[PDB]
């Protein structure tokens, strides 16, 4: 299957409460492997998956130096953005950054990402061609001109289409037991009266990995795309995911509905019916 | 592994 590596960074200003909060998290596919928190005791990049603990001190010194350098960049960027938007130091503001790479089943590069948000709105992003920038507004156009004048894109492309892929391949081989696995969903149905004349049917998928799944409800074999409640896919806390999909049905015609479960871990898609 | 770009906004 296809794989990805992503880093997510959140910088939050804290008026009169000292330095901004900085949080960095690294993922391979739907597995977290590293964190940094400005407010934690270590002041180190920290492992969050057993396979990355195999990496030696040169790895960890390097990642710690790089993540501390990002924290300092974002501290200045909070100040810059206040200048660009004529905003005082009294308010709390948020910078978000994300970057990473996707590979196919052959572990060859598919695409890269580098993008920022300010107070929950798109700010600047590298375009899919890796050669140009999309700028949300006039402040972002100031950033874009600085990055164009300094030829930042060629340095960034070198990481996204090269270094990033090399790291991901290294992690996929060293983490193969954790990362190159599929856990098929354990499924079941619940039944609740909402009226004297209708009931909720709830299709459950539990303990699955990776997070991508499709739950669909059919009424006499037709998709209920308008009439289905689906919750957000949610972490179990043990490295697996959970989801459910519900339909409200005429009480006594439960047996007319089918739930359909599709996941990379299933040899064939599952069908479930209410069994009272 | 993290990117090493020095660029500021």
């Amino acid at each position: 299957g296809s794989h990805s590596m992503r880093y997510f960074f959140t910088s939050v200003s804290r008026p009169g409460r000292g330095e901004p909060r900085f949080i960095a998290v690294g993922y391979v596919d739907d597995t977290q492997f590293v964190r940094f928190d400005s407010d934690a005791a270590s002041q180190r990049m920290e492992p969050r998956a057993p396979w990355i603990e195999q990496e030696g001190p040169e790895y960890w010194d390097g990642e710690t130096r790089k993540v501390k350098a990002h924290s300092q960049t974002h501290r200045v960027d909070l100040g810059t953005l206040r200048g660009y938007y004529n905003q005082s130091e009294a308010g709390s503001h948020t910078v978000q950054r994300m970057y990473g790479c996707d590979v196919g089943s052959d572990w060859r590069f598919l695409r890269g990402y580098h993008q920022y948000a300010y107070d929950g709105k798109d700010y600047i992003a590298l375009k899919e061609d890796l050669r140009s920038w999309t700028a949300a507004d006039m402040a972002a156009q100031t950033t874009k001109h600085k990055w164009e004048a300094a030829h930042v894109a060629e340095q960034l492309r070198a990481y996204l289409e090269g270094t990033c892929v090399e790291w991901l391949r290294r992690y996929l081989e060293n983490g193969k037991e954790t990362l190159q696995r599929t856990d098929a969903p354990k499924t079941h149905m619940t039944h609740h009266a909402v009226s004297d004349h209708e009931a909720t049917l709830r299709c459950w998928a539990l303990s699955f990995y990776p997070a991508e799944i499709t739950l669909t409800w059919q009424r006499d074999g037709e998709d209920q795309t308008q009439d289905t409640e689906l919750v957000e896919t949610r972490p179990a806390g043990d490295g697996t995911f959970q989801k459910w999909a519900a339909v409200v049905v005429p009480s006594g015609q439960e047996q007319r509905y089918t739930c359909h479960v599709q996941h990379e871990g299933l040899p064939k898609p599952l069908t479930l019916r209410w069994e009272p | 592994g993290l990117y090493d770009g020095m660029e500021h906004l």
Partner: T-cell receptor
Framework: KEVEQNSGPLSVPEGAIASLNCTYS??????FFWYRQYSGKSPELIMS????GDKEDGRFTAQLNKASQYVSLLIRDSQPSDSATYLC???????????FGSGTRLQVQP | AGVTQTPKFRILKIGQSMTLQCAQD?????MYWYRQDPGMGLKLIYY???????DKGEVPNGYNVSRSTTEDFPLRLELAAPSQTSVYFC?????????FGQGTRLTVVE
């Protein structure tokens, strides 16, 4: 130590290729540069490279081999006015300043 | 429209103090001081990643710097010693290219 170049002088006949080489210790280094310094003058960037492969800019070629931790500059059709010190500069893992080699003095003989 | 470093030349007697001026008008976050002895490479004295932030390089003993402002990165020599006879370069960067000042040739005399 961190960035190694032969100090030369490197004597090259006019019209021949001058071959300048550089090795670096930090395997994770991201950014590689050639700087040219005329006698008594300041260093001036002449080539930037970030990925494995080669880059041309007129008579200059830079090539980066990250697996061998080796960086090269070629000067094709070398002229006496190319006579200068060539400094390899490398940015190490998580560094925010350049580390310079001690330079190779190139002497293109007429 | 670049890095303005003064003075070009200076004589100090042993124990005297001086300030080397460095200014840039490019709004660069990163500034640097290097020294270069005869026929040798650049060594980092001090660098700054932004206003109010300064850190030690490879050869900091002898010197002090301040980055009150984005534009200015003065280098203070506190107590001139003969080992400090050298050429001093100020540089700025946005991210990639390091832009060098004209340099300061300092001789310390008994």
């Amino acid at each position: 130590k961190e960035v190694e170049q032969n100090s030369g002088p490197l004597s090259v006949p006019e019209g021949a290729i001058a071959s300048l080489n550089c090795t670096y210790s930090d395997r994770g280094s991201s950014s590689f540069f050639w700087y040219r310094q005329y006698s008594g003058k300041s260093p001036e960037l002449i080539m930037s490279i970030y990925a494995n492969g080669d880059k041309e800019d007129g008579r200059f070629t830079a090539q980066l081999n990250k697996a061998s931790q080796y960086v090269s500059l070629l000067i094709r059709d070398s002229q006496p006015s190319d006579s200068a010190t060539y400094l390899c500069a490398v940015r190490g893992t998580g560094r925010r300043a350049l580390t310079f080699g001690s330079g190779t003095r190139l002497q293109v003989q007429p | 429209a670049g890095v303005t470093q003064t003075p070009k030349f200076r004589i100090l007697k042993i124990g005297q103090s001086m300030t080397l001026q460095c200014a840039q008008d490019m709004n660069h976050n990163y500034m640097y001081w290097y020294r270069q002895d005869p026929g040798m490479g650049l060594k980092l004295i001090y660098y700054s990643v932004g206003a109010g932030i300064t850190d030690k390089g490879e050869v900091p003993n002898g010197y002090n710097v301040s980055r009150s402002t984005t534009e200015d990165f003065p280098l203070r020599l506190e107590l001139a010693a003969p080992s400090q006879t050298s050429v001093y370069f100020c540089a700025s960067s946005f991210a990639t290219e390091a832009f060098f000042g004209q340099g300061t040739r300092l001789t310390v005399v008994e």
